[PDB]
From a paper:
In recent years, the cysteine protease ubiquitin‐specific protease 7 (USP7), also known as herpes‐associated ubiquitin‐specific protease (HAUSP), has become one of the most extensively studied deubiquitinases. This is mainly due to its role in tumorigenesis‐associated signaling pathways and its interaction with the tumor suppressor p53 and the oncogenic ubiquitin E3 ligase murine double minute (MDM2). Herein, after a design based on molecular docking experiments, we report the synthesis of a series of mildly electrophilic compounds that covalently modify the catalytic cysteine 223 in USP7 through a nucleophilic aromatic substitution (SNAr) reaction.
Finally, a co‐crystal structure revealed that the prototype compound (7a) arylates the catalytic cysteine in the apo form of USP7 via an unconventional binding mode near the catalytic triad. The electron density of the new bond at Cys223 is clearly visible, whereas no additional density at any other cysteines or amino acids could be observed. As expected, the compound reacted in an SNAr reaction with the fluorine atom being displaced. The structure confirmed that the catalytic cysteine is modified in the inactive state of USP7, where it is less nucleophilic due to the disassembly of the catalytic triad. Compound 7a generally shows an unconventional binding mode compared with all crystal structures, currently published in the PDB. It reaches deep into the region where the catalytic triad amino acids His464 and Asp481 are located. Other published compounds are all oriented in the other direction of the ubiquitin binding channel. However, the exact binding mode must be interpreted with caution as compound 7a is close to crystal contacts. The omit map of compound 7a is shown in Figure 11A,B. The binding mode determined experimentally is closer to the ubiquitin site than the docking pose, with less extension into the pocket near the catalytic aspartate and histidine.
Author numbering: 206 to 500, 510 to 554
The structure:
Amino acid sequence: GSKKHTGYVGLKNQGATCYMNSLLQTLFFTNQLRKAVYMMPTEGDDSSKSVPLALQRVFYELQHSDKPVGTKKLTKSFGWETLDSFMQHDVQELCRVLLDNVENKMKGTCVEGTIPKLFRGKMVSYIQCKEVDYRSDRREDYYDIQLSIKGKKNIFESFVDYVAVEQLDGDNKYDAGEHGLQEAEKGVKFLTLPPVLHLQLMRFMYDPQTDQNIKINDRFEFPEQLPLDEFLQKTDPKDPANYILHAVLVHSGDNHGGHYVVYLNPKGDGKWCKFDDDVVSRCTKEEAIEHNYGGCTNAYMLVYIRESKLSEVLQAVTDHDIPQQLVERLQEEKRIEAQK
Ligand SMILES: [Br-]
């Protein structure tokens, strides 16, 4: 009775979908994304082709069902029906496939641009020659950050490594065009961080020593409250880059196989639940955070929310926020299913 115990319902365990159920709940409790998802015009869409419609159905069922929620129409919609599709991708790639479809269908509607407003940050990637006066600056958008964890104690050391300067010398000098091969230094700088911050922790890497993918179970620490102002080029006095832990996506075991689980405090109030496929239960703040540091269970992905955006991002979602037309289609679909 996980609806009774926590107010929330889980997702069925109906295939080797790995990180997918963890990711789906993470997006579901991004309330502003969920509300915008309900506003996509999918009335004319096909019921077995539309990723827009199928994520609406998942979100609607997660919001209304008392029983665990299936995902078969979702996985058929984006075309990942074998484990080979999930082994060949990681969680940030599935997140991009889901949000890209969702962003495109919002073009031309009243919620257009919801995906970049929530997940998009801006960075600058540069190469600077030392002996000649050349610099190449590349402004880039990002929707997620991949952070290395080997040889780093915590998130702060990972961000330090992320923004560090790489020296281009010797057999890896820089091609500076009319200047020939030049010694140079290369780095990235953050200009903005988005309201919802998706950080992947690189525990799954390719081993160069073998021809086998490995998992790094080393200890790596992350805080409930993460201050990131000092990694911005310019800080805002009225909006410091202080971030609040929302979600901890966890794996235990080997790279092949293993158990996938997500921890969340949906309201951002530090009251945590464990979402283990069809079973949702209350848990302590220590089980969600400290007990996933490593040293079996450990975190491979974190979601933070900017403190000034927390009330907006986690805005309340009523049944009235689902348009009555969408409700009628989904309840008609379920009435067709109920006759099955
Ligand atoms: Br299903």
